[PDB]
Nucleic acid binder design. Structure first.
Ligand SMILES: [Zn+2]
Ligand SMILES: [Zn+2]
Ligand SMILES: [Zn+2]
Lengths: 18, 212, 432, 127, 734, 100, 57, 270
DNA sequence: CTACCGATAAGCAGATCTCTCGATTGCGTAT
DNA sequence: ATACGCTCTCTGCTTATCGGTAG
RNA sequence: UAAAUCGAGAG
């Protein structure tokens, strides 16, 4: 639960929602 | 005892010619290998007292120097017959450099340069002026056993060096701008001297020191 | 370390800076006001050094994160010092800057042109252009020529920086090597030495009183001489409070921002934060989390932490000076007797000096007065400190120590271990 | 023979014969101290030590004053006089990239020497 | 699973103080069933500086595979055969095995078939991987009739044959050992060790062969067969000598310490001649002629004058020390090994002192001949105010024994005065030992703190942690110190050409290299250097740089340093010897390519350790304080500056002695015999009479004439005198 | 969303400049002792975590021995990123390098 | 106070005596052996001030 | 030890059948290497062995006060004549046989009777092994002391030796991985180690990690709202990530913030 | 005559490997 | 029975003050 | 459970 083996380290949006 | 002064001046003149020749300007070995009696005949009057106005001379870059360093200009070597350097002599020397448009002129004094005269050395860019005591040139430092061969690199070879090792100008080993060899070669801040160092374990190998 | 617990992030670099008084007031979970650590029945009294908002303490859940002693990381509080007090670390440079200042025009006693020249040289050194720094000195040829000289120097510096950046050499974050660091240190030393060598200001030529630091905790300024007083007319000993020093240096730093942007920054200041004289004054102390101030115990013998003693002394002095301030404030609305004002003001000055000495003792033991309790500095400086004793050399797990005996029939690359070590020492083998 | 005047003083030779002569003098003087005791130490170590002492064109020592100029604040702090170096690093707002071997220990990172002088990449077969 | 430590785990062993990196190694774990001590092989004691006098050390257990591979490959104890300080080995059998091999490799060592085979199997067990061929191969006996006998040299030969890998030639080494041929009788050649085709054919195996010593059998095996084979050979030799000592024991006793009747007679006759040494030395120092009786009043007066001075008594204690040491040397030369009752190899004291197993020649000299002069900080025994060196000696006694010359020996004991002097010497030794350790740690700390970041980069240049360049190439040749031991051992590499060719193997290293460009550039540079290099160094214009500057030595075969190339050419020229010079030069160039220092090497740490750790063993400043001047302080104000001046062959020593007097300073006080001040007050008067030495005296000693002295007095002396007088009056007006 | 894309493009372009192309690498063709040691250590760590194995385990239980066996046969799927002091780097697969 | 002096070795005097050192004046009679015990009554110290010294004369 | 400074630890308790045995049937209870005497020069031990054997044979005691013998009457002569009058040889050697092979040794063996002392330095007082155990409170490193199950110290002089080997992972395993390794949360934007904290969720929510410094008090400002035990509601400060550091780093950051110094750590993946 | 550039005499700071045991830990009024 | 205030250094740098220049 | 100081030791 909430580990680097489960959740992404960093998540960023590349483009605006479409 | 005046013979001792004559001999010291002869040695200083020889070392100044050697310095000019090493800097890349055209000086023939006839001038360098000057016998003492020939020097006395050429530069001492009937009384035998040398005059330092005739010792001043001019030098021009060689063909190879112009090929390698295109930016070089004429050099003017001045001796001061006066036992001291004042404001009058230094400013006159600067104006003499300017009016003939010399790219570099090196000053040789006898005892000391007045601090009011020392203010005019960096006065006129780009033509730099260098100061050398006569007593500091009686023996050529570069002829010493411990000192290696210093060869100032051209801009293209400096590019090649800083490209091969992927360096900034500052990451190189530094040689002080006021240490005797840098004054000898006439190093201006920024350019690299290659040093051919004789090693106890590897023989000849090349180092590089930038002047800053 | 557990190889089955990867860490996705990594620290790439660290940078040093002053912890401003505004931010600590925001990060803090609680401030401490009562210099009593724990009340009767052994419970930690709220608002004291051991507060449940500063971390779980002795089987009491932390009031901040709600976690027990094992899982509470700890939280930092602060002390609202009644007056700004000198930071003992920065006191020497603050004393350098206080001298060589013109109280009238709020500039340095050195002329503005030379100061601008040094600022340009320092900014050139920020990008590693040590070559151009000396070429800047070759620009020297009343009151309007100096402005043109400054404009041309600024243009030359900008041109050099732009060319060097564009000529594949430097990026936005500058080049910082050892040699450029040495040149910057030499230039800044010459700058500071030159500031200390002045007679009077060169923008309004009035003499300024000569300060004198007797020791820490006190700065004494001599009065202006009679003959020097005359010039302040023709151009138209004493103790000094910490607030007056702060105001003087705040005004000076506000005036000379363009020059101190390059004395307090070795690299391009991308954040564009102004350099403030408040950085030299610790208006608010920061108390560490109680996890780092726990009391020592040996059976019955229980002793409180020394840092707690220093902070309690600071709080006691703070309450004393606050009481004196209230006593003055009541008379401010209705003044009765100036002699009572005299004695209360003498007590207030003594309180100022005492609280400054308390701060000095809390940070640096050798800067205290009146064997003593070590400060924060004394915990890091020498051997048995924190760098040489707990960072460069640590104590380790899974290690044994024993007296050796010789053994042939050992393969000269082997070590013969006892059965006890073979039973205690272990290796984590993942099952496959 | 004025061209062969070698001197025990490793600073006057720097003053009159420049940097490299001083470096050679450093090597030779740090050599014959081991020659008296008949101790074999290769000139490769002595050469590096001399080159490090004279890297700035001057005669630097191995002490706090000699190390006064360096990019890594953690090294100078950990050596001695931690608080003076800390004040100098915080007033200059210095930022260190954790490149010294001592700097990476404070933060807890893999070293930049030997096995830490490179990275390891996996070749995953499927894009 | 947090499993227990096993036999396949590695462990980091360290013993404080960790002066050099070899004092912290990685060992493969073997767990023993009995006792609570860390059991360590004897060869590891060389690097840890560890005895078994209750010494303790630390075992660390790495907890991940990354630190496992480091200790098994980088901190591995097999990789630590050669110390990086100078490339000398620091591993080998120490004390019992050396004497065991001196006995075993003697000519008297004959072993029957059962003994030979049992000795061979006692160390090369072919089930622990000790041998290669899966079957212990033996040798035909040296003697076939009357009955089969082998030899100890054959035991060594078959040990090497079993440990050395097959499909490879045997070792070929011509070396020497520590025992002179005169200790084996007339016509012996056992001082020269000769391995041919992997067979010991001559000489004795010694400390210089197996042990921390260069160019021995173990060093050669390490260089030719690799480090693992050398470690295996060390283990096998240790087991072999252990099993030989358990069946053929070694002992030392009181019989080994005795001299014959003639030896004692020689010693007494020589020592009787020392009854006049001290008096003669004193007469020399006191300038009395000779034969002067010890109680000559003038001699006593001048001896008392000498004692009161720390410099004159410093030469008295140096002149007498030389004579008594000469007497000691005569005694030792005469009385060993000639005067010994038991001779080498039977005399085990000499057996283990000559072979290097333990002790020295001075130890056996003290045991058997005399202790000799006792030196207190370079001087003799201190003297009381009364002039007595001890209560039992009359004041200013001109005796060698009075000054601290012990004629006794540890075999027959020493007299109470000699006992006291020896106690002084031993106490001084202990004080120096205690003070030396504390005097060296700070130097290594200072060096390590700054040099810790310096390392070799993948540009093959070495530079600091933040990137600042320090050197362009390690030493100018990029050669590892621990891999250049046999680079210039050209005859050794020739004699083992095929063995080295099996490992270097150029046939597999051609697809990933450039072979001809570096060789061509080297040829050009060598030709130009030979054409030039008769003129001074400043005149030589550098048209061609050394090949290391342009071509990477790790990527271009033939790019080697100029010294190595010149030595290789000289070797290939001097002697012409199925190996031709072309293949040999190719092999040597490939060996140079493989002898380079790897990028990432902690070169600065290694240099700091190699300057600090050897500093533990430690008119002009000399020793560790001198280092303190150079590295730690960089003192421009050197304590004792000196300057060296060459001399033209034209000048003569008569001129030379006078030139040194024309530069040396001469104070005015050096010529004044005396000063007389005649003060008569009532204005104050003074007659400052100055009486000089005779003009012929100072005009010769200092070459100072009357005119120069008088001018100095008129101009310099009186000005300083008046200034000092005015200053004193000014400061005395209070 | 747009600031992050600019940051990503800047970082990827700066990394692309650092990478020395495969035909310009001038470092040693051999594998250094440190490189071999860390290759073995990392491969052993991977194998210990149920990584696919490209060699036959002749009754071996030590992951480090499995890594050594794969290194002998040059079946290790790893890449060494050698770093120059400037920050530019070179990529060498284990197959390209030659041990000792 | 005499018991304190014996049990700590500190010499607490408002008017310091002619002696130099101020601590380490009493030693525990270890009584590990009889040699160890009898040695305590025949050993004389130069003074603990000389223990913190660089010279060895 | 003996009375001549020949100290040494026991290595193996040699079974009596494996010990060398003499012509009289006895085997020694102490074996001391002959390679200890030549460099130490403890001839007193040799002559004491001689005198002890002579006295035990004759049932007497020999005085050994120094300076009773001379260079004329060497003690070797005196005790050798005493040994010879009892049958044994003049030099104190005895013919012994190896207890393993059973054959006679190459030469006679020097054996006698000497006085041996047992020193008070046992191994049970000196051996120590730690896998895990108690830790120091403010550094989370192993404690000091054998009696407290504390770890041993890897100081700077071992740190530089580990650097010299080039073993970077050994240095990380000693100094970091197994001394005070911890995974601390760092605020990615403010770059501070100790300014982060957990959250006190509602019943049904999940406690996350938030930063005091990089958050706004909700009064001055529903997926960014977090609360602490005190109840003061905050918004933001949700940009934090785990980083592996020593705990002494956190302690140093705290002590530095006590000085007014702020350390900002830049994490790589942003 | 007066202000800048050094040039010493004097003052001041930090500083000169690991490990194991035991023993003590303050007094001085004020209430 | 009991609580709160305290007499034998090595290397520099850094400071104060003394002359000379030239302004 | 802690810390100094003193004292005693080991390599
Ligand atoms: Zn909490
Ligand atoms: Zn003003
Ligand atoms: Zn934050």
């Amino acid at each position: 639960t909430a580990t680097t083996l489960n959740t992404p380290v960093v998540i960023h949006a590349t483009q605006l929602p479409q | 005892e005046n013979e001792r002064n004559i001999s010291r001046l002869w040695r200083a003149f020889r070392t100044v010619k050697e310095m000019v020749k090493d800097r890349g300007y055209f000086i023939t070995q006839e001038e360098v290998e000057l016998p003492l009696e020939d020097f006395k005949a050429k530069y001492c009057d009937s009384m035998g007292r040398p005059q330092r106005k005739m010792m001043s001379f001019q030098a021009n870059p060689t063909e190879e120097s112009i090929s390698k360093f295109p930016d070089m200009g004429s050099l003017w070597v001045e001796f001061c017959d006066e036992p001291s350097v004042g404001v009058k002599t230094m400013k006159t020397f600067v104006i003499h450099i300017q009016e003939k448009n010399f790219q570099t002129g090196i000053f040789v004094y006898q005892n000391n340069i007045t601090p009011s005269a020392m203010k005019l050395v960096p006065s006129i860019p780009p033509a730099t002026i260098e100061t050398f005591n006569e007593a500091a040139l009686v023996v050529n430092i570069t002829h010493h056993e411990l000192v290696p061969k210093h060869i100032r690199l051209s801009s293209d070879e400096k590019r090649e060096l800083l490209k091969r090792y992927r360096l900034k100008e500052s990451q190189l080993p530094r040689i002080q701008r006021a240490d005797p060899v840098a004054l000898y070669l006439g190093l201006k801040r920024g350019e690299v001297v290659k040093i051919i160092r004789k090693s106890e374990t590897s023989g000849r190998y090349a180092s590089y020191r930038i002047c800053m | 370390m557990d190889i089955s617990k990867p860490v996705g992030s990594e620290i790439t670099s660290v940078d040093f800076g002053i912890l401003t008084a505004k931010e600590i007031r925001n990060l803090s979970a609680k401030q401490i006001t009562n210099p009593t650590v724990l009340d009767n029945l052994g419970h930690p009294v709220s608002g004291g050094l051991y507060d449940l908002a500063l971390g779980a303490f002795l089987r009491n859940l932390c009031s901040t994160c709600g976690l027990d002693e094992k899982f509470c990381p700890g939280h930092q509080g602060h002390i609202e010092l009644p007056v700004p007090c000198y930071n003992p670390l920065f006191f020497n440079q603050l004393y350098i800057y206080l001298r060589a200042s013109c109280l009238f025009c709020h500039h340095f006693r050195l002329k503005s042109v030379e100061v601008h020249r040094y600022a340009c040289k320092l900014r050139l050194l920020q990008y590693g252009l040590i070559d151009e720094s000396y070429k800047l000195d070759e620009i020297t040829l009343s009151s309007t020529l100096l402005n043109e000289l400054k404009s041309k120097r600024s243009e030359y510096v900008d041109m050099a920086i732009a060319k060097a950046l564009s000529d594949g050499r430097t990026t936005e974050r500058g080049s910082f090597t050892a040699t450029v660091n040495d040149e910057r240190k030499k230039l800044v030393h010459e700058f500071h030495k030159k500031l200390l060598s002045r007679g009077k200001c060169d923008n309004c030529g009035m003499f300024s009183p000569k300060f004198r630091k007797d020791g820490f905790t006190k700065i004494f300024e001599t009065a202006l001489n009679e003959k020097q007083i005359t010039n302040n007319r023709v151009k138209g000993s004493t103790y000094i409070l910490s607030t007056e020093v702060k105001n003087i240096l705040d005004t000076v730093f506000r005036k000379e921002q363009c020059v101190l942007q390059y004395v307090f920054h070795s690299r391009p200041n991308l954040s564009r934060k102004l350099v403030k004289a408040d950085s030299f004054f610790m208006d608010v102390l920061v108390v560490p989390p109680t996890r780092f101030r726990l009391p020592s115990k040996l059976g019955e013998e229980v002793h409180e932490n020394s840092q707690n003693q220093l902070l309690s002394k600071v709080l006691t002095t703070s309450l004393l000076i606050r009481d004196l301030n209230d006593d003055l404030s009541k008379l401010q609305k209705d003044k009765v007797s100036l002699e009572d004002r005299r004695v209360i003001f003498s007590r207030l000055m003594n309180a100022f000096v005492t609280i400054q000495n308390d701060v000095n003792a809390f940070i640096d033991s050798t800067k205290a007065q009146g064997v003593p309790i070590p400060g924060v500095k004394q915990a890091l400086e020498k051997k048995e400190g924190l760098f040489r004793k707990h960072m460069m050399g640590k104590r380790v797990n899974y290690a044994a120590r024993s007296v050796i005996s010789p053994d042939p029939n050992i393969e000269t690359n082997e070590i013969g271990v006892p059965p006890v070590f073979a039973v205690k020492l272990t290796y984590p083998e993942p099952v496959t | 023979d004025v061209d062969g005047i070698t001197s025990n003083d490793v600073a006057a030779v720097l003053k009159t014969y420049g940097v490299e002569a001083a470096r050679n003098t450093i090597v030779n003087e740090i050599n014959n101290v081991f020659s008296r005791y008949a101790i074999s130490v290769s000139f490769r170590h002595l050469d590096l030590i001399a080159d490090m002492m004279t890297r700035q064109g001057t005669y630097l020592a191995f002490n706090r004053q000699g190390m006064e100029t360096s990019t890594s604040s953690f090294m100078k702090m950990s050596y001695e006089t931690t608080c003076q170096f800390l004040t100098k690093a915080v007033l200059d707002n210095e930022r260190e990239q954790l490149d010294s071997p001592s700097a990476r220990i404070v933060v807890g990172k893999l070293n930049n020497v030997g096995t830490g002088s490179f990275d390891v990449l996996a070749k995953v077969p499927n894009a | 699973v947090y499993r227990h430590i096993k036999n396949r785990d590695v462990v980091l062993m360290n013993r404080q103080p960790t002066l050099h990196k070899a004092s912290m190694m990685g060992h493969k774990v073997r767990v023993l069933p009995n006792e609570k001590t860390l059991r360590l092989h004897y060869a590891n004691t060389g690097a840890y500086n560890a005895d078994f006098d209750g010494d303790e050390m630390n075992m660390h257990f790495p907890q991940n595979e990354n630190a496992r591979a480091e200790a098994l490959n980088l901190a591995n104890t097999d990789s630590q055969y050669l110390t990086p300080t100078s490339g000398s080995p620091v591993r080998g059998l120490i004390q019992d095995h050396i004497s065991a091999g001196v006995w075993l490799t003697s000519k008297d060592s004959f072993f029957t078939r059962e003994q030979y085979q049992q000795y061979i199997y006692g160390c090369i067990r072919p089930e622990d991987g000790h041998t290669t061929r899966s079957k212990i191969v033996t040798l035909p006996p040296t003697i076939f009739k009357p009955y089969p006998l082998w030899t100890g040299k054959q035991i060594i030969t078959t040990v090497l044959l079993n440990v050395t890998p097959p499909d490879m030639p045997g070792i070929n080494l011509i070396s020497k050992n520590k025992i002179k041929n005169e200790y084996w009788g007339k016509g012996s050649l056992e001082n020269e060790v000769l391995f041919k085709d992997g067979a010991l054919l001559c000489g004795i195996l010694d400390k210089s062969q197996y042990g921390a010593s260069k160019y021995g059998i173990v060093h050669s095996l390490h260089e030719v067969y690799g480090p693992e084979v050398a470690a295996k050979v060390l283990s096998v030799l240790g087991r072999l000598f252990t099993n030989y000592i358990t069946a053929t024991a070694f002992t030392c006793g009181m019989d080994d310490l005795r001299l014959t009747a003639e030896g004692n007679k020689w010693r007494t006759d020589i020592l009787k001649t020392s009854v006049d040494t001290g008096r003669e030395a004193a007469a020399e120092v006191t300038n009395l002629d000779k034969d002067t009786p010890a109680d000559d009043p003038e001699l006593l007066k001048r001896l008392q004058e000498i004692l009161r001075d720390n410099n004159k008594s410093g030469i008295l204690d140096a002149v007498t020390s030389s004579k008594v040491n000469a007497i000691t040397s005569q005694v030792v030369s005469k009385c060993v090994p000639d005067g010994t009752m038991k001779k080498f190899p039977c005399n085990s004291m000499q057996a283990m002192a000559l072979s290097g197993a333990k002790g020295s020649n001075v130890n056996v000299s003290q045991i058997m001949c005399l202790l000799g002069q006792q030196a207190l900080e370079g001087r003799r025994v201190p003297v009381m105010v009364s002039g007595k060196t001890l209560p039992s000696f009359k004041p200013y006694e001109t005796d060698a024994m009075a000054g601290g010359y012990v004629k006794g020996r540890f075999y027959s004991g020493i007299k109470p005065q000699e006992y006291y002097f020896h106690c002084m010497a031993g106490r001084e030794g202990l004080i120096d030992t205690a003070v030396k350790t504390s005097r060296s740690g700070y130097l290594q700390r200072c060096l390590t703190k700054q040099l810790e970041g310096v390392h070799v980069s993948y540009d093959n240049s070495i530079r600091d942690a933040d990137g600042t360049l320090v050197q362009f190439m390690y030493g100018g040749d990029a050669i590892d110190i621990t891999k250049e031991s046999h680079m210039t051992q050209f005859e050794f590499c020739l004699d083992n050409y095929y063995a080295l060719l099996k490992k270097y193997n150029p046939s597999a290293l051609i697809e990933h290299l450039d072979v001809e460009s570096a060789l061509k550039y080297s040829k050009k540079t060598l030709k130009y250097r030979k054409k030039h290099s008769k003129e001074p160094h400043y005149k030589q214009s550098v048209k061609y740089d050394p090949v290391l500057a342009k071509y990477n030595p790790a990527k271009y075969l033939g790019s080697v340093s100029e010294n190595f190339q010149d030595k290789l050419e000289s070797f290939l020229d001097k002697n012409s010897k199925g190996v031709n010079e072309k293949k040999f030069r190719a092999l040597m160039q490939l060996k140079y390519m493989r002898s380079l220092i790897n990028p990432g090497e902690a070169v600065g740490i290694i240099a700091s350790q190699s300057v600090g750790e050897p500093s533990t063993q430690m008119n002009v400043t000399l020793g560790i304080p001198r280092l303190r001047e150079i590295v730690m302080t960089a003192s421009a104000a050197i304590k004792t500056p000196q300057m060296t001046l060459p001399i033209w062959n034209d000048v003569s020593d008569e001129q030379a002695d006078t030139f040194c007097k024309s530069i040396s300073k001469v104070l005015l006080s050096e010529v004044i015999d005396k000063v007389i001040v005649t003060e008569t007050t009532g204005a104050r008067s003074y007659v400052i009479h100055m009486r000089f030495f005779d003009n012929n005296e100072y005009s010769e000693e200092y070459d100072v004439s009357k005119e120069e002295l008088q001018n100095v007095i008129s101009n310099q002396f009186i000005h300083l005198l008046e200034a000092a007088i005015v200053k004193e009056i000014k400061k005395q007006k209070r | 969303p747009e600031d992050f894309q600019q940051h990503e493009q800047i970082r990827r372009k700066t990394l692309k400049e650092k990478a020395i192309p495969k035909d310009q690498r001038a470092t040693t063709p051999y594998m250094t002792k440190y490189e071999r040691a860390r290759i073995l250590g990392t491969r052993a760590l991977q194998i210990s975590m149920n990584a696919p194995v490209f060699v036959d385990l002749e009754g071996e239980t030590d992951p480090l021995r499995i890594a050594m066996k794969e290194l002998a046969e040059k079946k290790i799927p790893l890449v060494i990123r050698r770093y120059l002091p400037d920050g530019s780097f070179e990529d060498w697969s284990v197959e390209e390098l030659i041990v000792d | 106070k005499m018991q304190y002096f014996l049990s700590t070795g500190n010499l607490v005097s408002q008017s310091g005596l002619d002696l130099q050192q101020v601590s380490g004046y009493t030693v525990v009679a270890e009584k590990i052996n009889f040699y160890r015990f009898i040695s305590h009554f025949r050993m004389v110290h130069r003074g603990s001030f000389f223990a913190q010294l660089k010279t060895t004369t | 030890s003996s009375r001549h400074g020949q100290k040494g630890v026991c290595s193996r308790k040699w079974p009596t059948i494996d010990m060398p045995f003499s012509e009289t049937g006895i085997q020694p209870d102490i074996i001391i290497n002959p390679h200890a005497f030549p460099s130490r020069m403890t001839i007193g031990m040799f002559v004491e062995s001689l005198a002890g054997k002579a006295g035990a044979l004759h049932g007497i005691a020999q005085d050994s006060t120094p300076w009773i013998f001379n260079e004329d009457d060497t003690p070797a002569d005196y005790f050798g004549e005493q040994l010879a009058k009892a049958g044994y040889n003049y030099h104190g050697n005895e013919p012994m046989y190896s207890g393993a092979t059973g054959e006679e040794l190459r030469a006679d063996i020097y054996v006698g009777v000497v006085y041996y002392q047992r020193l008070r330095h046992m191994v049970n007082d000196k051996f120590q092994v730690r896998s895990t155990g108690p830790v120091n409170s403010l550094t989370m490193q192993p404690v000091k002391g054998r009696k407290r199950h504390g770890g041993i110290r890897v100081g700077e002089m071992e740190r530089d030796a580990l650097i010299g080997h080039g073993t970077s992972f050994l240095l990380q395993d000693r100094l970091l991985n197994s001394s005070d390794y911890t995974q601390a949360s760092v605020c990615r934007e403010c770059g501070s180690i100790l300014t982060t904290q957990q959250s006190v969720p509602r019943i049904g929510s999940i406690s996350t990690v938030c930063c005091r410094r990089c958050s706004m008090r909700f009064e001055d400002a529903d997926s960014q709202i977090w609360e602490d035990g005190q109840g003061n509601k905050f918004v933001g400060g949700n940009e934090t990530t785990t980083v592996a550091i020593p705990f002494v780093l956190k302690y140093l950051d705290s002590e530095l913030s006590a000085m007014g110094i702020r350390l900002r750590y830049n994490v790589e993946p942003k």
